[PDB]
Write a protein that binds this ligand. Sequence first.
Ligand SMILES: NS(=O)(=O)Nc1ccc(S(N)(=O)=O)cc1
Ligand SMILES: NS(=O)(=O)Nc1ccc(S(N)(=O)=O)cc1
Ligand SMILES: NS(=O)(=O)Nc1ccc(S(N)(=O)=O)cc1
Ligand SMILES: [Zn+2]
Length: 257
Amino acid sequence: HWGYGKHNGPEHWHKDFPIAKGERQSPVDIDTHTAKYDPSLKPLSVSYDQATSLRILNNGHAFNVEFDDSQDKAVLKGGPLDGTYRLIQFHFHWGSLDGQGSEHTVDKKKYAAELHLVHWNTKYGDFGKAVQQPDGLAVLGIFLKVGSAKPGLQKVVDVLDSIKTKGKSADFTNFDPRGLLPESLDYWTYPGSLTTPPLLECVTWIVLKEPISVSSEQVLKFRKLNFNGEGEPEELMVDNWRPAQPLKNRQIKASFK
Ligand SMILES: NS(=O)(=O)Nc1ccc(S(N)(=O)=O)cc1
Ligand SMILES: NS(=O)(=O)Nc1ccc(S(N)(=O)=O)cc1
Ligand SMILES: NS(=O)(=O)Nc1ccc(S(N)(=O)=O)cc1
Ligand SMILES: [Zn+2]
């Protein structure tokens, strides 16, 4: 069905998911000069010391590293968030070339890729119930640029050959997501949505200002994945990003001055 091709890409999504033209859609361009420092923001807290990864899956749109979220582990709190949000999975969006790939942009600049660490508000019980609330999710977005290799990303890169096609999964335990974070937690935040259908508007976006560096070799392996399932014509999993959407009645807040 929906995808990133000419006949099922972002421009077509609204037909089956009308919210695609909603009032708080993501991603968006982050105009750094218009963004305003917000003193009401509390310190951001990323506590992944107890994170328990379980599996990695090629879902035909990207690959998800899934976590066991049945217990109070790997949580995000503070910042613009009220309460605790639990990590359920992370994935990336990337391009066919280093010059594009990210969903959010900074002053219209597109990064090579973008990491999304997905969390759900614990007050709602689980992910399913959370996506029915305006503040059900919190996604920590991190930009990727091509340069030095990111050591903490290699284990992910080396398992991709086992989940080349749609529907394939593989055991992926003991992966520490702390190895994917930049040094600084400075960020921009705004109310948005999921960037892929169903495009639900339940996300508080927290996009870090400092990008992490990954090597050309690492991202090239991302590009070897397939959108298609085994035995079908090969279509490389590249450019699986949605372009910036209208900001509409929203303001982007900065955690730094
Ligand atoms: N969300 S959407 O992009 O409109 N969904 C969609 C778009 C195109 C087709 S198809 N394969 O052309 O019939 C099927 C589903
Ligand atoms: N809830 S869990 O079984 O521990 N883990 C889990 C992790 C990820 C997803 S999903 N399908 O990515 O939303 C669903 C469940
Ligand atoms: N695929 S889903 O079950 O709706 N969950 C989901 C989770 C996160 C995002 S995103 N790209 O981080 O906005 C999009 C969809
Ligand atoms: Zn995403």
